């Protein structure tokens, strides 16, 4: 998923 750890 988004690599910053935040849901899409």
């Amino acid at each position: 998923q988004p690599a910053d750890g935040n849901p899409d």
Partner: antibody, heavy 122, light 108 residues
């Protein structure tokens, strides 16, 4: 070769705390993101937590939110899992695993450690 | 959360036969799906990511397919070392989730 070696597992009383470590070698640790994945005895895999470039970027499974914290120290080529308020249901082998990244998205775990066993019991 | 179901939970096949393993998702995950192999006493091993990209060093007899909610892992001809447990993992959104696994055992 890429190697990931977990340590810090052992016996802990319910409600206690434990810190897992994962030492990385054979690649530039700071060029990769990481996850912890656990496996209760005789059960399937359960993702626990994920970390990106720094402690600023983390994500957690609902079952551990608020209790576990994933962190990294690139100078030591090490990943960590701080586990608080442990419960018997947290008993499992804990694996650290490297993530595949492309185009700003992580896509799977291409290298796994051998795991470290955490037992939560009185 | 995105729920993954692997059915059947056990496949009983002979060496040399074709194996078709299924993973179905409760929501659209596009091609963000990984497959893993695990043998008793060993850590999981990545087989497939982005649904169909073979991982490093994985034999060509392994191929992944699918998109959306239905995915397949196919072993064209089973070798002895292929009898193991297989897990899928969706990489579409946080939190990550796994299927329950499919065990491929030797029929005798």
């Amino acid at each position: 070769q890429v190697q990931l070696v977990e340590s810090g597992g052992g016996l802990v009383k319910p409600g206690g705390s434990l810190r897992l470590s994962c030492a990385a070698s054979g690649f530039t640790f700071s060029d990769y993101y990481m996850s912890w994945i656990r496996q209760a005895p005789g059960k399937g895999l359960e993702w626990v937590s994920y970390i990106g470039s720094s402690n600023t970027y983390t994500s957690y499974a609902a079952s551990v939110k608020g209790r576990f914290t994933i962190s990294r120290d690139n100078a030591k080529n090490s990943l960590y899992l701080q586990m608080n308020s442990l419960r018997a249901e947290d008993t499992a082998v804990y694996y650290c695993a490297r993530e595949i990244e492309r185009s700003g998205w992580v896509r799977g775990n291409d290298y796994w450690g051998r795991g470290t066993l955490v037992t939560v019991s009185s | 959360e995105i729920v993954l179901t692997q059915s059947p939970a056990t496949l009983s096949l002979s060496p040399g036969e074709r194996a078709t393993l299924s993973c179905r998702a409760s929501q659209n995950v596009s091609t963000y799906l990984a497959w893993y192999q695990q043998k008793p006493g060993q850590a999981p091993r990545l087989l497939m990511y982005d649904a169909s990209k073979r991982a490093t060093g994985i034999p060509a007899r392994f191929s992944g397919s699918g998109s959306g909610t239905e995915f397949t892992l196919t072993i064209s001809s089973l070798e002895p070392e292929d009898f193991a447990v297989y897990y899928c993992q969706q990489r579409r959104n946080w939190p990550l989730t796994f299927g329950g696994g499919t065990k491929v055992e030797i029929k005798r």
